[PDB]
Amino acid sequence: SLYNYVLFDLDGTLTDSAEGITKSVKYSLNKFDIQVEDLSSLNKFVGPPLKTSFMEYYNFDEETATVAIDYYRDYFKAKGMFENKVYDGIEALLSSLKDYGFHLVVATSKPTVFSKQILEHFKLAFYFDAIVGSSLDGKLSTKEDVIRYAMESLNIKSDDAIMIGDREYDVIGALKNNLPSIGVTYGFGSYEELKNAGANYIVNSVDELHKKILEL
């Protein structure tokens, strides 16, 4: 069952971006006079499309969530994206995989423009064949839609790739594209969240992730 492609989500899988993201959300919510006790309570915003999150957690409508997304970006584009860190072992993982011959791709709900700046900023950009994110306008943004477009763009077949993510959204997006998925628990999703989502494989560390990708 040799497959050549490995798709990765960005936030919570490759980078520990909680600080910058939760701070951008807090900055945005505060503009609505919504206070938050501690950033940690905004961790759930890490991974899914911002729109879905603002609407779900704050009952905003389409247009209001869009305004909230813009405030978020005022801070994220200039400070938030940098209040980030690459998970330990990740670059080692990426290097090892390309050596094996795997083609690596980023498939994320995060806007492509930010994802590229971040990966280049962290010097990991060239490990990837493509970095496919959402469009700033949100026309293309759900996990299912970005994975589908990434596969279409690179002409990747369902039997030649797997999806790596930390949230149920990644599992659902993978399933919807007929791709097996490896969920990681070192991110912002829990074992239970991934198991109930249907994750095809679940690991608790980057090293475990490395091993699993191979024996797959």
- Can you give the binding site for Na ion, defined by CB under 5 A? 9, 11-12, 47, 166
In sequence order, which residues have a C-beta less than 8 Å from that of residue 56 and are 6 or more positions away?
A: none
For Na ion, the closer CB: 52 or 64: 52
In sequence order, which residues have a C-beta less than 8 Å from that of residue 25 and are 6 or more positions away?
A: 36, 42, 45, 50, 72
Query: Rounded to the nearest whole angstrom, what is the least distance from the CB of residue 106 to Na ion in the complex?
Result: 11
* The residue to which tokens 């700033």 are assigned: 136
* Partner interacting with residue 166 (select from Na ion, Cl ion, none; CB below 5-8 Å by kind): Na ion
Q: Which residues in 109-138 contact Cl ion (CB under 5 A)? A: 110
Using the contact rule CB under 5 A, the part of the chain among 55-63, 104-112, 160-168, 189-197 near Cl ion is 104-112
Using the contact rule CB under 5 A, the part of the chain among 108-116, 179-187, 190-198, 206-214 near Cl ion is 108-116
For Cl ion, the closer CB: 25 or 184: 25
* The residue to which tokens 């996990």 are assigned: 143
Which residue type occupies 215?
A: E
Nearest to 209 by CA among 168, 146, 165, 174: 165
**Residues engaged in binding Cl ion (CB under 5 A):** 110
